[PDB]
Design an enzyme around this catalytic site. Structure first.
Site, PDB file in Angstrom:
ATOM      1  N   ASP A  31      -3.944  -4.338  -0.769  1.00 25.56           N
ATOM      2  CA  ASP A  31      -3.424  -5.669  -0.525  1.00 25.56           C
ATOM      3  C   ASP A  31      -3.496  -5.790   0.982  1.00 25.56           C
ATOM      4  O   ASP A  31      -3.985  -4.879   1.634  1.00 25.56           O
ATOM      5  CB  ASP A  31      -1.992  -5.839  -1.048  1.00 25.56           C
ATOM      6  N   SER A  55       4.321   4.311   2.773  1.00 27.42           N
ATOM      7  CA  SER A  55       3.498   4.106   1.573  1.00 27.42           C
ATOM      8  C   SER A  55       2.040   4.462   1.841  1.00 27.42           C
ATOM      9  O   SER A  55       1.318   4.921   0.941  1.00 27.42           O
ATOM     10  CB  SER A  55       3.591   2.663   1.085  1.00 27.42           C
ATOM     11  N   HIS A  79      -2.166  -2.661   2.977  1.00 29.37           N
ATOM     12  CA  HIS A  79      -2.435  -1.287   2.523  1.00 29.37           C
ATOM     13  C   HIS A  79      -3.907  -0.996   2.368  1.00 29.37           C
ATOM     14  O   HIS A  79      -4.586  -1.658   1.578  1.00 29.37           O
ATOM     15  CB  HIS A  79      -1.757  -1.036   1.174  1.00 29.37           C
TER      16      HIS A  79
END
Ligand SMILES: *[C@@H]1O[C@H](CO)[C@@H](O[C@@H]2O[C@H](CO)[C@@H](O[C@@H]3O[C@H](CO[C@H]4O[C@H](CO[C@H]5O[C@H](CO)[C@@H](O)[C@H](O)[C@@H]5O[C@H]5O[C@H](CO)[C@@H](O)[C@H](O)[C@@H]5O)[C@@H](O)[C@H](O[C@H]5O[C@H](CO)[C@@H](O)[C@H](O)[C@@H]5O)[C@@H]4O)[C@@H](O)[C@H](O[C@H]4O[C@H](CO)[C@@H](O)[C@H](O)[C@@H]4O)[C@@H]3O)[C@H](O)[C@H]2NC(C)=O)[C@H](O)[C@H]1NC(C)=O
Ligand SMILES: *[C@@H]1O[C@H](CO)[C@@H](O[C@@H]2O[C@H](CO)[C@@H](O[C@@H]3O[C@H](CO[C@H]4O[C@H](CO)[C@@H](O)[C@H](O)[C@@H]4O)[C@@H](O)[C@H](O[C@H]4O[C@H](CO)[C@@H](O)[C@H](O)[C@@H]4O)[C@@H]3O)[C@H](O)[C@H]2NC(C)=O)[C@H](O)[C@H]1NC(C)=O
Ligand SMILES: *[C@@H]1O[C@H](CO)[C@@H](O[C@@H]2O[C@H](CO)[C@@H](O)[C@H](O)[C@H]2NC(C)=O)[C@H](O)[C@H]1NC(C)=O
Ligand SMILES: *[C@@H]1O[C@H](CO)[C@@H](O[C@@H]2O[C@H](CO)[C@@H](O)[C@H](O)[C@H]2NC(C)=O)[C@H](O)[C@H]1NC(C)=O
Ligand SMILES: *[C@@H]1O[C@H](CO)[C@@H](O[C@@H]2O[C@H](CO)[C@@H](O)[C@H](O)[C@H]2NC(C)=O)[C@H](O)[C@H]1NC(C)=O
Ligand SMILES: *[C@@H]1O[C@H](CO)[C@@H](O[C@@H]2O[C@H](CO)[C@@H](O)[C@H](O)[C@H]2NC(C)=O)[C@H](O)[C@H]1NC(C)=O
Ligand SMILES: *[C@@H]1O[C@H](CO)[C@@H](O[C@@H]2O[C@H](CO)[C@@H](O)[C@H](O)[C@H]2NC(C)=O)[C@H](O)[C@H]1NC(C)=O
Ligand SMILES: *[C@@H]1O[C@H](CO)[C@@H](O[C@@H]2O[C@H](CO)[C@@H](O)[C@H](O)[C@H]2NC(C)=O)[C@H](O)[C@H]1NC(C)=O
Ligand SMILES: *[C@@H]1O[C@H](CO)[C@@H](O[C@@H]2O[C@H](CO)[C@@H](O)[C@H](O)[C@H]2NC(C)=O)[C@H](O)[C@H]1NC(C)=O
Ligand SMILES: *[C@@H]1O[C@H](CO)[C@@H](O[C@@H]2O[C@H](CO)[C@@H](O)[C@H](O)[C@H]2NC(C)=O)[C@H](O)[C@H]1NC(C)=O
Ligand SMILES: *[C@@H]1O[C@H](CO)[C@@H](O)[C@H](O)[C@H]1NC(C)=O
Ligand SMILES: *[C@@H]1O[C@H](CO)[C@@H](O)[C@H](O)[C@H]1NC(C)=O
Ligand SMILES: *[C@@H]1O[C@H](CO)[C@@H](O)[C@H](O)[C@H]1NC(C)=O
Ligand SMILES: *[C@@H]1O[C@H](CO)[C@@H](O)[C@H](O)[C@H]1NC(C)=O
Ligand SMILES: *[C@@H]1O[C@H](CO)[C@@H](O)[C@H](O)[C@H]1NC(C)=O
Ligand code: NA
Ligand code: NA
Lengths: 355, 363
Positions: free
Chosen positions: A303, A21, A306
């Site tokens: 968050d 991600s 990330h």
């Protein structure tokens, strides 16, 4: 001047990044808050065509599980920034009585083989393996786990439920193939009798046999132990000697040989509220692999997990070329430095006093 | 200035050379003409304590045959100048109907494993392996050859002969061996492969080595692949200390009799290998050059025939020039040669090891 930088980079345009991600430009389309602060890469790279990355995934995960992404890519200099999506946090084990530590061993072994081979091949992809089998028995999912909401279902290797104890498969279309050879190992909880398993892969053309039998070694917990073979194109028979038959369903397809070119690996971990592991660091050894890490917790801005400043700083090296890659870091310039490049690759500077 | 030199050398005094007659200081004592012109090394190195070399031998030869020298040595930077004493000239094959090419393949595979491992260990020696066996069948020399006078007798692996006098069930097709005392062990796993003399039918063989402790199995069965001759095909495994069973599945039982004992791990340090060949009146091979690949190995060779001064095959100026680098330290070892100095050069060191010079235009 020209101190080694804690970055991943490249000598020229011929590089490729495999990620998750934190490198996945498409993931913005599945987020409520639509900006790129979830990424540790510079979004300018989204249009490079040099990334294969999928939110929530990893090479190990796509290799073994039904939650699959077709990681595919080709380059001289290969970089990995993935692994976190299979960690002790995810907590995977095949059975209730299983053991996540076994799966950490599996992870280390898989990445050892992958990193070593990607120093010798330009091209990686993941291919399906089919088999022929002269029985009525079919595939069964006997390795699966629910944690953190998500259910993970192992689908490589295939387990053939119960009885013919062999199956043929062909490996074609690649120079080498990474496949798993696995057995269940350990004692049943309630009985404390060791599980009996056997698995051989035989190359019909060469006569070469790789096998793995279960043993009575104290490893309390019953779970799947895998070793990762690099095989050549050919016709194989999978043989379980009248015990549970397994056969590979997926392989890492290695193509396009190249002169030895070390890979670069960035530590892939969660913020410290989740348990991470150092399996990719065990896998990443000299001279075939350079390992990069920050000196701090992963403190995401998007968050917790990330958009970390330290890891963004490491990945920032993909925006420019460097002269030389080495154990202690990348050297931007090819002429002089205050330290001697260790295990260098490239056009590397000297640390002598120039007279 | 500071062009790469076609030599083998070392960054410091922590090196070791494995060799043959061309590096063997004791061989003078068995020669009629007693000077050191048979050597390609500087005889000043005789007192270094950094050479294990034996006239008429090689690592592959001692590994497989009864004409055995206990090659033993330890260093950071390992150098090999041997191999010539097992070449197509020697002409070895297990049987009349055999094939020397198979043995050249074996040679390539052995040195591939050896060179790779010696980039990761300081210390090499050769150890005997013993076995236990619950049968009355004994060892037989099934692989031997006479050529150029010399008779060569393979003794690794051991072949355990079936007593055809006795009932077939007397023939046990397994044996136990232990590997201990080393970090890793190089051992041969071999089968006979090919068609019988005056026969269309292929020889049937099988050999497994099973690690009792880990459950890991390495096996090799004969196939029906068109090859030429019936001979012994070997693969070379790097095994870990443990208890093993050797299993032949009711066919000919073989078990290792010798191993290369690898000890004392080190940070990756490429090996240096010097081309070991005869003067061109004898046939040599390039198997050690197949085995010697980047990044684990640097290969060194002259651009001329081996023209020995002592006799045709001993005391060549080009090879003496290569080996002359062992008399001094260099800054850096690389694909194209050794760089004496660590600062500047006119070429970029390729796959370097050491403190390497730059070829940039200094400002
Ligand atoms: C260590 O040394 C080895 C051995 O020297 C080195 O290996 C050599 O590397 C060289 C240089 O790179 C290679 O040269 C290139 O060769 C190809 C042609 O290759 C194919 O043919 C070869 C000849 O085979 C004939 O002869 C033998 C009998 O001896 C027979 O077995 C064959 O069946 C064949 O006979 C048939 O054909 C004949 C005509 O050719 C007929 O008369 C006859 O009747 C038959 O019909 C053959 O050896 C070779 O085999 C190799 O490859 C196959 C598969 O790929 C593999 O299975 C084998 O086992 C071998 O590995 C091939 O079949 C040629 O096309 C190239 O030409 C280019 O370059 C030259 C420059 O010289 C130019 O002139 C050309 O214009 C063109 O650009 C080139 O010459 C050589 O193949 C190879 N030899 C061997 C035995 O491997 C090795 O590199 C060294 N390693 C190190 C690290 O140093
Ligand atoms: C270390 O360095 C040495 C010295 O260079 C190399 O020695 C050479 O070995 C090669 C390969 O075996 C030889 O190359 C062959 O040349 C033949 C004709 O040369 C004649 O002239 C030389 C002098 O130049 C004489 O010494 C020699 O006796 C010869 O009479 C060719 O006919 C050969 O052709 C064959 O191979 C090619 C390549 O694939 C095929 O295309 C052909 O069809 C044919 O099969 C070949 O080119 C050379 O003769 C050797 N030179 C010398 C000076 O001895 C070593 O090989 C090298 N070591 C390693 C491991 O590489
Ligand atoms: C690093 O060097 C490479 C050249 O090795 C540059 O790559 C070029 O990038 C463009 C992008 O549009 C490509 O289309 C070109 O074909 C590439 N050129 C070549 C010659 O390969 C790259 O731009 C360099 N990086 C930086 C930051 O300048
Ligand atoms: C898998 O491959 C093996 C080996 O090719 C097959 O065994 C052969 O099958 C043919 C046709 O049945 C027979 O004529 C041969 O006797 C067999 N050869 C050997 C060496 O046993 C086998 O049929 C295949 N199995 C499956 C499930 O496809
Ligand atoms: C690996 O495991 C298989 C299955 O347990 C072993 O094969 C069996 O061995 C037992 C004990 O010797 C026999 O009673 C069975 O008859 C065997 N089954 C078959 C189909 O052979 C096998 O021996 C093990 N491999 C090794 C090298 O020990
Ligand atoms: C990457 O760096 C991090 C941060 O330094 C390492 O995590 C630390 O590890 C030390 C030594 O094990 C622990 O005492 C610290 O508590 C950890 N710090 C934090 C902030 O979590 C991490 O282990 C390194 N990764 C690898 C694979 O070595
Ligand atoms: C070759 O030399 C080595 C090392 O000198 C010998 O290994 C020693 O052998 C004894 C008896 O086998 C062992 O107990 C020692 O532990 C070994 N020494 C070391 C340093 O490992 C080896 O046996 C010799 N080989 C032969 C065939 O004589
Ligand atoms: C290693 O094996 C060799 C030969 O296989 C042993 O040498 C033989 O030893 C016997 C009695 O010890 C002698 O009668 C023979 O003459 C020897 N044969 C040869 C060819 O030398 C040797 O002792 C073994 N070494 C160790 C350390 O076990
Ligand atoms: C390797 O070779 C051995 C011996 O030929 C094979 O073991 C025998 O296999 C045959 C033919 O399939 C069976 O009829 C026998 O029951 C086996 N004999 C014994 C004593 O086990 C072996 O199967 C081959 N290995 C593989 C993986 O194909
Ligand atoms: C090593 O290379 C760098 C980069 O080209 C050189 O730095 C340049 O030096 C000149 C002369 O002072 C400046 O005008 C350039 O602006 C510099 N560029 C950068 C990026 O700093 C450096 O001089 C070289 N070092 C040596 C010793 O030759
Ligand atoms: C992944 O993509 C490659 C490249 O297109 C393709 O060859 C391969 O079959 C794909 N893998 C799967 C599992 O579909
Ligand atoms: C991984 O962590 C273990 C202990 O947790 C440690 O012993 C080992 O050195 C680590 N390996 C690497 C390469 O960081
Ligand atoms: C490199 O080192 C040598 C000897 O140490 C010295 O004589 C020579 O001038 C040096 N060259 C440069 C450019 O520093
Ligand atoms: C080989 O080892 C096994 C144990 O794994 C044992 O039962 C058997 O007796 C041994 N055979 C010999 C000849 O030592
Ligand atoms: C090589 O280096 C070592 C120390 O690094 C030194 O003791 C040795 O004498 C040097 N050899 C020569 C010939 O200078
Ligand atoms: Na199985
Ligand atoms: Na056998």
């Amino acid at each position: 001047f020209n101190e080694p930088l804690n970055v991943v980079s490249h000598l020229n345009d011929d590089w490729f990044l495999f990620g998750d991600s934190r490198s996945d430009c498409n993931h913005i389309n599945n987020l409520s808050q639509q900006n790129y602060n979830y990424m540790d890469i510079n979004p300018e790279l989204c249009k490079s065509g040099k990334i294969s990355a999928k939110a929530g995934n990893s090479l190990f995960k796509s290799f073994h599980f039904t939650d699959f992404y077709n990681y595919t890519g080709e380059g001289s200099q290969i970089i990995f920034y993935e692994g976190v999506n299979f960690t002790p946090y995810v907590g995977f084990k095949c059975l209730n009585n299983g053991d996540n530590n076994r799966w950490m061993g599996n992870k280390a072994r898989f990445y050892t083989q992958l990193y070593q081979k990607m120093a010798h091949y330009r091209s990686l992809s993941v291919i399906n393996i089919t088999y022929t089998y002269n029985g009525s028995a079919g595939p069964v999912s006997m390795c699966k786990h629910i944690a953190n909401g998500v259910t993970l279902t192992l689908n490589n290797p295939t387990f053939i439920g119960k009885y013919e104890s062999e199956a043929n498969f062909t490996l074609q279309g690649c120079d080498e193939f990474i496949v798993p050879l696995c057995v269940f190992n350990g004692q049943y909880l309630s009985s404390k009798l060791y599980y009996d398993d056997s698995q051989y892969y035989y190359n019909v053309d060469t006569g070469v046999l790789y096998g793995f039998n279960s043993t009575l070694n104290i490893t309390s917990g019953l779970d799947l132990t895998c070793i990762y073979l690099a095989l050549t194109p050919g016709n194989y028979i999978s043989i379980s000697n009248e015990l549970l038959l397994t056969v590979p369903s997926k392989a890492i397809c290695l193509r396009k040989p190249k002169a030895f070119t070390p890979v670069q690996v960035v530590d892939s971990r969660w913020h410290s509220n989740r348990q991470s592991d150092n399996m990719t660091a065990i896998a990443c050894q000299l001279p075939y692999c350079y390992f990069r890490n920050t000196t701090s917790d992963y403190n995401g801005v998007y968050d917790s997990h990330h958009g970390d400043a330290g890891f963004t700083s490491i990945l920032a090296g993909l925006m420019y070329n460097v002269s030389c890659l080495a154990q202690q870091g990348a050297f931007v310039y090819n002429n002089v430095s205050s330290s001697w490049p260790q295990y260098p690759y490239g056009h590397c500077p000297t640390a002598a006093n120039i007279v």
